[PDB]
Design a protein around this ligand. Sequence first.
Ligand SMILES: [Ca+2]
Ligand SMILES: [Ca+2]
Length: 280
Amino acid sequence: MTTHLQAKATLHNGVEMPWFGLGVFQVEEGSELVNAVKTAIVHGYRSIDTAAIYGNEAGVGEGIREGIEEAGISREDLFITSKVWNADLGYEETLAAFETSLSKLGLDYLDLYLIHWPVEGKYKEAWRALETLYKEGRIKAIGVSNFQIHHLEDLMTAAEIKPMINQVEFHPRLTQKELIRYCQNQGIQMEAWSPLMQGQLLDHPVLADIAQTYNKSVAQIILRWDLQHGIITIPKSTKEHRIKENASVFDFELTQDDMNRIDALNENLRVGPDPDNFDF
Ligand SMILES: [Ca+2]
Ligand SMILES: [Ca+2]
């Protein structure tokens, strides 16, 4: 369980993945990016999550490089995640895109590689490419992002390997109860993209009350709540003080009452794109 920054979940194939990691986001590239990734690693993060649609894997690659050397660790102590973008879903296309991603990140293998979206008519051939790459020992774990129950059901009529991760929007106003249950029952590990959702709750009175009783920020208590729900969490940030502070989530625990107070905030409000109704 979620006792320290370098605590790991075990995926269904035995792979240890950090409960807590750094989300990379549409930044920029170079100076600020590179420093954010380095800063997080040196501080003690051991999971970095990116996507090719970013367009910043080269920045991530260098940030990993200097992170590694200044922390005095190995590439192998880190857990790196990338994703195939929609435009690149398909068998050969996805094989090619994985190689592209590996080059830019400066890596010989990924720890986890995800399908970014359930693009109807393309994601099954994409999955087959993930399975091949998995079977070849090129990726430690393989999974999926933004899949609904019915997408996972449909995937598993023809899949030889079951997804190990389902990386999803998840926060107090979108608590995803049915999907989380379904996934836990399948052995598919939940991960939250954008757990803090651009700071959207950071004035909420329930959460401000809870934050205050613990002498924590709202962000800190949200992130702890992700963790006590058993969901892997990857908050985005580029600001050093923020990167450090978001990880300070292990000096306390939320009671079952605090957890029910935050769960009660569910509104079924999706802030990101609808997995059943998207066009990109
Ligand atoms: Ca492209
Ligand atoms: Ca975030």
